Amino acid sequence: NEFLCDEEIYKSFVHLKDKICEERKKKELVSYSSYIKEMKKLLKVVLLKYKALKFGESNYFFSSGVLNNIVSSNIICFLLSELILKNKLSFDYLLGASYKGIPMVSLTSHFLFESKKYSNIFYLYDRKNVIVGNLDEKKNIIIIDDVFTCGTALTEILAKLKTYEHLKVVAFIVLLNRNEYEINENNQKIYFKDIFEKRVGIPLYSILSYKDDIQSMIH
Amino acid sequence: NEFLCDEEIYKSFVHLKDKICEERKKKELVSYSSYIKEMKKLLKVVLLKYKALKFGEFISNYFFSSGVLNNIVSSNIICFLLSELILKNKLSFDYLLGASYKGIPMVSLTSHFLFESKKYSNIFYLYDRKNVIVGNLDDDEKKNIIIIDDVFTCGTALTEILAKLKTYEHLKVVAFIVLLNRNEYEINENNQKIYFKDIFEKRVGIPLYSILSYKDDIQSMIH
């Protein structure tokens, strides 16, 4: 048994969470970034421990089902909440993409609520009546999901939401962006994230990325 | 408008959550019960404020919908109390399973309140789709599951989850916990009410617990 035990993970989560909040309040950006990076290290340990990441022939596989435990989801949902606060994203609703986003959205709401900036936080989810929650000049939605490859899943949710005239999506937040790309006529990588952001006019944020976080696990 | 504002609801939730935990730790049962009953009052105010309860005539004299409870001020109270049912009744479990869809955002947050008890090194939660059970499974001794859902009428929805779980040989359900039991019944040959809860418990051999019940909590709202 080769990884930090859950009791140690939690202790480290608590310490890092306190420092990250403290530094955000003090507006010390360099320290904030650094403590975020430490939390991301802890999260990568978790991903390996619970085997959310597996290696060997893509050269890695990612599954979020093994992250449905509170010690793991605390880290994840805390960091989703931090992306919202750090980037000062304004919203009326958070929407958890079915199914993986759904247990994330309540718990992320819980971490946001600790900022004391909100009198409540209203969250939604989509089935497969297709949008459920406290509904009915445009209301703004941030969508949460686990993984971004080409944007196929987020595009389907956008289709469901096009029906609802008074709703607008203003951001996507995700645990992992795979940094997928296509090569163009000049032998340059054109990333799906950039193509997707351009097509739908909405920014995507991610806790982790293949390039910054996963590739250094490969060897 | 006519109801406590969300800031006040939260302040009251915090106060009552602290007293409830304190009294459970001290094993003062009468005080614990009493503070639970205060939280239930607050929850009833929430159900009326967000119109999770509506009155008149439906297909019964009240209608219940949990979609308006998907906000943290309301789900705090609900999920806290689901956690307290687990603790108070000393229910042992390896997993919590949130019934799709309503139970799913409840299960993580209920896991969060359980985790505050410091009895657990982690809490592992599941959910079903409609491959069919998602979470930290190795499994196809038995692992124990408590199922969480919003409303119990005859048990049709819980029965469907049991069917999905029958495939998994190493899993066993040891309790159902629910926000509301409607206390539905049939009348028998002696003009006695036989409750679906009792019939359901007997058929599947698994206890059901509920935060609220029609008889104890909702009837007095009617007039």
Describe the structure.
The structure is a homodimer. By secondary structure, chain A is α/β, with parallel strands linked by helices. Chain A has one domain: 3-Layer(aba) Sandwich (Rossmann fold). In chain A, 44% of the residues lie in helices and 23% in strands. Chain A has seven helices and ten strands. In chain A, strands 5-4-3-6-7-10 form a six-stranded mixed β-sheet, sandwiched between helices. In chain A, helix 1 (6-25) runs antiparallel to helix 2, helix 1 (6-25) packs parallel to helix 3 (70-86) and helix 3 packs across helix 4. The radius of gyration of chain A is 18 Å and the shape is globular. The interface between A and B is large, with 35 and 36 residues. It is classed as transferase. The entry lists the keywords Rossmann Fold, transferase. The assembly is dimeric.
In short:
Chain A has 219 residues and is α/β, with parallel strands linked by helices.
**Which oligomeric form is depicted?**
homodimer
Structural class of chain A: alpha/beta
Number of folding domains of chain A? 1
Q: Which two chains have the most extensive interface, and how many residues on each? A: A-B, 35 and 36 residues
Strand content of chain A: 15-25%
**How would you describe the shape of chain A?**
globular
How many H/I helical runs of chain A?
7
> How would you write the strand order of the largest sheet of chain A?
5-4-3-6-7-10
- Give the H and E element order of chain A: HHEEHEHEEEHEEEHEH
Helix fraction of chain A, binned, reads 40-55%
According to CATH, what is the topology of chain A?
Answer: Rossmann fold
In whole angstroms, the N-to-C terminal distance of chain A is 21 Å
| CATH top level class name of chain A | Alpha Beta
CATH architecture label name of chain A: 3-Layer(aba) Sandwich
Biggest sheet of chain A, in brief? 6 strands, mixed
Strand tally of chain A is 10
Pfam family, one (chain B): Pribosyltran
GO molecular function, one term (chain B): orotate phosphoribosyltransferase activity
EC number (chain B): 2.4.2.10
Protein name (chain B): orotate phosphoribosyltransferase
